[PDB]
Scaffold this motif. Sequence first.
Motif, PDB file in Angstrom:
ATOM      1  N   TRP A 109       0.750  -0.962  -0.042  1.00  0.00           N
ATOM      2  CA  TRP A 109      -0.179   0.099   0.024  1.00  0.00           C
ATOM      3  C   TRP A 109       0.926   1.290  -0.112  1.00  0.00           C
ATOM      4  O   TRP A 109       0.722   2.052  -0.647  1.00  0.00           O
ATOM      5  CB  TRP A 109      -1.027  -0.080   1.279  1.00  0.00           C
ATOM      6  CG  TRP A 109      -1.681   1.298   1.329  1.00  0.00           C
ATOM      7  CD1 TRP A 109      -1.080   2.381   1.632  1.00  0.00           C
ATOM      8  CD2 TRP A 109      -2.906   1.485   0.870  1.00  0.00           C
ATOM      9  NE1 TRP A 109      -2.166   3.396   1.575  1.00  0.00           N
ATOM     10  CE2 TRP A 109      -3.265   2.915   1.156  1.00  0.00           C
ATOM     11  CE3 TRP A 109      -3.862   0.700   0.402  1.00  0.00           C
ATOM     12  CZ2 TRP A 109      -4.667   3.392   0.855  1.00  0.00           C
ATOM     13  CZ3 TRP A 109      -5.160   1.238   0.101  1.00  0.00           C
ATOM     14  CH2 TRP A 109      -5.254   2.572   0.397  1.00  0.00           C
ATOM     15  N   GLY A 164       2.507   1.880  -3.054  1.00  0.00           N
ATOM     16  CA  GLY A 164       1.655   2.333  -4.204  1.00  0.00           C
ATOM     17  C   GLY A 164       1.333   3.842  -4.167  1.00  0.00           C
ATOM     18  O   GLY A 164       1.462   4.335  -5.046  1.00  0.00           O
ATOM     19  N   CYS A 165       1.302   4.378  -2.605  1.00  0.00           N
ATOM     20  CA  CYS A 165       1.206   5.695  -2.637  1.00  0.00           C
ATOM     21  C   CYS A 165       2.620   6.567  -3.410  1.00  0.00           C
ATOM     22  O   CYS A 165       2.427   7.534  -3.708  1.00  0.00           O
ATOM     23  CB  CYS A 165       0.835   6.021  -1.037  1.00  0.00           C
ATOM     24  SG  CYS A 165      -0.441   5.454  -0.479  1.00  0.00           S
ATOM     25  N   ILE A 174      -8.337   9.049   2.029  1.00  0.00           N
ATOM     26  CA  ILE A 174      -8.312   7.472   1.167  1.00  0.00           C
ATOM     27  C   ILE A 174      -9.667   7.380   0.712  1.00  0.00           C
ATOM     28  O   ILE A 174      -9.904   7.414  -0.376  1.00  0.00           O
ATOM     29  CB  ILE A 174      -7.869   6.227   2.199  1.00  0.00           C
ATOM     30  CG1 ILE A 174      -6.455   6.699   2.596  1.00  0.00           C
ATOM     31  CG2 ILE A 174      -7.958   4.914   1.324  1.00  0.00           C
ATOM     32  CD1 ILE A 174      -6.012   5.406   3.896  1.00  0.00           C
ATOM     33  N   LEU A 218     -10.983   6.725  -3.441  1.00  0.00           N
ATOM     34  CA  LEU A 218     -10.963   5.273  -3.650  1.00  0.00           C
ATOM     35  C   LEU A 218     -12.367   4.606  -3.234  1.00  0.00           C
ATOM     36  O   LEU A 218     -12.718   3.406  -3.302  1.00  0.00           O
ATOM     37  CB  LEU A 218      -9.879   4.414  -2.957  1.00  0.00           C
ATOM     38  CG  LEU A 218      -8.557   4.738  -2.933  1.00  0.00           C
ATOM     39  CD1 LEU A 218      -7.638   3.635  -2.036  1.00  0.00           C
ATOM     40  CD2 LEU A 218      -8.153   4.554  -4.729  1.00  0.00           C
ATOM     41  N   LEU A 237      -3.412  -0.643  -4.636  1.00  0.00           N
ATOM     42  CA  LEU A 237      -4.258  -0.057  -3.851  1.00  0.00           C
ATOM     43  C   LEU A 237      -5.438  -0.685  -3.309  1.00  0.00           C
ATOM     44  O   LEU A 237      -6.590  -0.203  -2.788  1.00  0.00           O
ATOM     45  CB  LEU A 237      -4.290   1.446  -4.213  1.00  0.00           C
ATOM     46  CG  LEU A 237      -3.082   2.357  -4.212  1.00  0.00           C
ATOM     47  CD1 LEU A 237      -3.512   3.918  -4.623  1.00  0.00           C
ATOM     48  CD2 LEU A 237      -2.116   2.289  -2.767  1.00  0.00           C
ATOM     49  N   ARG A 269      -4.956  -7.189  -2.624  1.00  0.00           N
ATOM     50  CA  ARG A 269      -3.896  -6.537  -2.847  1.00  0.00           C
ATOM     51  C   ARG A 269      -2.572  -7.316  -3.471  1.00  0.00           C
ATOM     52  O   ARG A 269      -2.111  -8.642  -3.075  1.00  0.00           O
ATOM     53  CB  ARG A 269      -3.266  -5.679  -1.448  1.00  0.00           C
ATOM     54  CG  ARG A 269      -2.785  -4.561  -2.046  1.00  0.00           C
ATOM     55  CD  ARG A 269      -2.453  -3.362  -0.497  1.00  0.00           C
ATOM     56  NE  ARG A 269      -3.573  -3.289   0.186  1.00  0.00           N
ATOM     57  CZ  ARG A 269      -3.634  -3.071   1.319  1.00  0.00           C
ATOM     58  NH1 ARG A 269      -2.516  -3.173   2.208  1.00  0.00           N
ATOM     59  NH2 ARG A 269      -4.793  -2.895   2.235  1.00  0.00           N
TER      60      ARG A 269
END
Length: 290
Positions: A181, A184-185, A209, A213, A261, A268
């Motif tokens: 995660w 990813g960010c 978030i 999302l 994400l 994931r």
Amino acid sequence: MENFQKVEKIGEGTYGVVYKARNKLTGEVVALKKIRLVPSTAIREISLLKELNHPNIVKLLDVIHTENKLYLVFEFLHQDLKKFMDASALTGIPLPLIKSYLFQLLQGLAFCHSHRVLHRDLKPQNLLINTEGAIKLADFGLARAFGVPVRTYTHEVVTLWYRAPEILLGCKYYSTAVDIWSLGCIFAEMVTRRALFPGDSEIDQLFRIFRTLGTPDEVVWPGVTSMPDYKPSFPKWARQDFSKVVPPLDEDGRSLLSQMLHYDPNKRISAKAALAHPFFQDVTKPVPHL
Ligand SMILES: NS(=O)(=O)c1ccc(Nc2nc(OCC3CCCCC3)c3nc[nH]c3n2)cc1
């Protein structure tokens, strides 16, 4: 640590001060972490890191334990991803480099993760670069080892920006996907030149978030509503298109980021699987200017 001559404050980490330092005997240039309390399990935990060796993982050189104070001596790199991101903001980091770095960090996570080790606190500031095009993860395994607080010994706020939702929703046991995660960010952030989720409290972080999302539910995330910090009162936001989240990014890239994400930590994609993603079909390794 009488065998080291401090060269300068590289920065305040979670755990204390990191200094660039010089070995007075061996001439070697190093990063020295003072750790602020020592405790048994932590010493055994550190000592497994000594063996967790990978090209994309900053090397743990030595662990020094004296006068009950603790010092960690690491290989030194000359720049971090943030300063590079800053440096290069007028034009952004060329996509081929972004891809190279993502691929190498992924290789890094694949290594640690297959040995069961998590980072738990990835961020531009612990991603470290060199002049030969390499990028490496710094502070692997230190979270399980020491603990994480709110304020650093210097009551700098630890950032929430890269934290995974299951962490913020209070799951007591997380897995490796928490690092996916984060990475990813960091990917989105490289691509767009602005933090994806710059939360400045846990609910602000959770609500940012949610806004991008969609507020998780039992459809996207089985089991979600019964996690400790989940409140049926969360405002109910709609999911945005990713063409809007990370615009310049191409399809293979919007596709990878998406799976890094996913709400459900279980679904994931893992490092290993990411590495095989079509986005890396054309991967290379350029040298950053620096
Ligand atoms: N800002 S910067 O670009 O001027 C620059 C940055 C870091 C380094 N070098 C470097 N730094 C580390 O920790 C930096 C770290 C402290 C703890 C939390 C995140 C930040 C290291 N930890 C092992 N090895 C390390 N090597 C050189 C230049």
